[PDB]
Amino acid sequence: MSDNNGTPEPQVETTSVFRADLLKEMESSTGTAPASTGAENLPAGSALLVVKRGPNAGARFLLDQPTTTAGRHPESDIFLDDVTVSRRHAEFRINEGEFEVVDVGSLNGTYVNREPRNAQVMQTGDEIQIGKFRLVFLAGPAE
């Protein structure tokens, strides 16, 4: 298996391709880059992402489902307010306890681990830049 087993909902929306200045702000953020290890240890087989800056900043969401879609979508588990309406910006796919980010937008330029990435293998401590706001991916509950 490889694809999301079920039905991804097709979306029609108009996305503007960003030519943004936020890359300068990313550079202003250059200082320390959090690094964590132990993602493959799997605390409870789950992982969470905390909004460090953004509309929902301060909230942490946990990925408990095998497929987590992010962006504006009626069925997106991770709802983030974009600058435009991103019907499909990124999805986090959980396969055998491993987390992969697949960017299905590249519209703003998805940065995963602070770098533009179309497909990413997630690690704890990974920083995801969605628009001009950022999410920090952390290992989930160790309950």
Side-chain angles (χ1 to χ4, degrees), residues 21-30 53 129 132:
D21 181 83
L22 59 78
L23 48 72
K24 178 185 295 171
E25 179 174 69
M26 180 86 300
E27 185 186 277
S28 303
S29 182
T30 308
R53 182 182 179 189
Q129 187 69 29
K132 62 181 292 75

Side-chain angles (χ1 to χ4, degrees), residues 27-101:
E27 185 186 277
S28 303
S29 182
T30 308
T32 188
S36 304
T37 42
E40 56 285 89
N41 291 31
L42 293 176
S46 181
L48 56 77
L49 72 172
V50 60
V51 190
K52 194 63 175 178
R53 182 182 179 189
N56 38 26
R60 63 175 182 157
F61 303 93
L62 64 166
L63 298 71
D64 180 87
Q65 57 285 330
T67 308
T68 311
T69 308
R72 192 289 285 160
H73 186 226
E75 307 307 289
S76 50
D77 197 73
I78 302 300
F79 181 77
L80 302 174
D81 291 277
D82 191 290
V83 187
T84 194
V85 181
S86 44
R87 60 183 174 125
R88 291 296 178 157
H89 191 208
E91 54 175 66
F92 308 99
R93 300 156 66 127
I94 298 71
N95 180 30
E96 300 302 83
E98 303 189 88
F99 302 80
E100 60 176 81
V101 189

